[PDB]
Structures are given as structure tokens and as C-alpha cells.
Amino acid sequence: ITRTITSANIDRLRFTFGVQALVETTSKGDRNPSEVRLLVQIQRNGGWV
Amino acid sequence: TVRAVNAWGQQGDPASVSFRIAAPAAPSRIELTPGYFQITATPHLAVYD
Amino acid sequence: IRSVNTVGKSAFVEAVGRASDDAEGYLDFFKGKITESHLGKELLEKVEL
Amino acid sequence: TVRAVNAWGQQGDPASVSFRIAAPAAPSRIELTPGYFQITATPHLAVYDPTVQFEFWFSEKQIADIRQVETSTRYLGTALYWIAASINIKPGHDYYFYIRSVNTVGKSAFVEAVGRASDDAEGYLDFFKGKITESHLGKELLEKVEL
Structure with a gap:
């Protein structure tokens, strides 16, 4: 995504992420977890660490 | 509608959500197997309830 | 239903059902077991002659 | 874990208990009564579990692995x-x-139980006694008999 905040008087950054749904439906019904994974990275000059 | 109140009992601005409760969906498909002077009817919904 | x-x-959903109409499949189980006495009396007396 | 607190909010030493919630026991004895082209399967449990039910799956032939039931x-x-x-x-x-x-x-x-039909034709044919009069027979026997 990236947004280039480039503010001046910031101290800490808080990210509000999430998932719209997490069910794992199967045939005939029922549901199970889903194992979603996300990653938050910083610019750090040239290398996104 | 949910409102927040502080230690002095002052409620905050309301936040609203909406939902619905409706009758279940009608059966999608019908399996009518025949037999000896008998009929076995099994309905199935598009989404399991 | x-x-x-x-x-x-x-x-409501209306489903039209029918019986087996597959007598021969059931008669295959009736194979070689109707010996003498199941037949109607008219056939018994005619056959005895 | 349960702790006791007095009127001043000071929690006491903890007391612990443990328990478990597991899947219901598999059926022990299965009664497969036969009938006229029909099989009635009644599973049973060693101990009765009010909330339990039984999933029945049908196979015209056996499968080597019991884990393929959900697909085979x-x-x-x-x-x-x-x-x-x-x-x-x-x-x-x-x-x-x-x-x-x-x-x-x-x-x-899963537990697999082998069921069979009645294979007792004579018992059902006894109910057919002296009732098939003339017209149920095939046309070939009708014409052969009429001569």
C-alpha cells in the first residue's frame, strides 16, 4: 500500500490493521480458523526492513 | 446504539450498528428418491443452517 | 416443504415425487421361490388338470 | 484457578482445578438389522451421551483407508x-x-460396520400366499398356459 506520511512532529506510529472475515467454510457446513499473516515494514533509507 | 460514559456519568457521542433477523431461506434443491410404494424426500438449502 | x-x-416449495415403477428389480429377488401355493386357486385347479 | 480476596482487595493464595472437554466416544456396538431391500443401522455407545448424534456414510464397497470416508x-x-x-x-x-x-x-x-439385506424371500412370499390369481404372470406363461 504505502502512504509516505513524512510528518514533522511524530513520536510513535500505530497501525490499525485487521481482517474482514476469518471463517473456513467446508461442504455440508461448519467453520474453522484461517491463519492470516501480515507484515509491517519501514522505509529505512533504501532497504525495507 | 452504544455510548461511552466516564467516571462522572457523562455519556459520549453514540455509535450505531445495524443487523437483521429473518426467516430461514427456502430449500434450494429437493432429492426425491423412489422406492417400494414409498418416496423419500430430502431438501437441501444453498447455505447450511 | x-x-x-x-x-x-x-x-413453501413444491416438489413432485414418483414411486419406483421398477418392479423387475424387486422381482429379481423373488427368483425361484414361488413354488406352488402362492398362485390363485383358479390357476391351481387349471394347472392340476 | 480461584483466589480469595478480602474487603481490602488483597487476593489470597490460588487454588487450582483441572478438567477436559473432548470429542464423544466412537460407537461401540452397531445393530444392522436387515429388511426388504433395506438396512437399518442403529449405533450404540458404551456410555450414553445426551448431546451426541451419529453421522452415517454409505459405501457400496469397502475402502482400504478409513480416512477417505469424507471423499470416497x-x-x-x-x-x-x-x-x-x-x-x-x-x-x-x-x-x-x-x-x-x-x-x-x-x-x-469413524467406525465401519458391514450390513446385509434380508435375503429371506420365503418369509415375504408367505404373505403372497394364494393371491396372484392369473394376470401377474408374464405374457409368455399366459399364452403357454392357455393352450
């Missing part, structure tokens, strides 16, 4:  | 007992029922 639960009842 | 067999349904009756069911051929105990907590391991 209509989907019903505690919340309410759904609209 | 036809899921008959869920009940306390199941009756299977169709023209595809014929006496003299064995069938298999993969049944497992299920409830809200979870599903038990």
Missing part, C-alpha cells in the same frame, strides 16, 4:  | 439411527456404513 425454525417459517 | 463415500446424514433403502440396494451384496459420533464439541473417529 418449507424451512422452519424458532425465528419463523419460510415460503 | 456418500454422506447419508446425521441421526440416532438410519434406514437405507433404494433400488440400488439389492439383497445378496454387502454394503458398508461408516458412522461416527458427532456433537457441538467435535467429531469422533
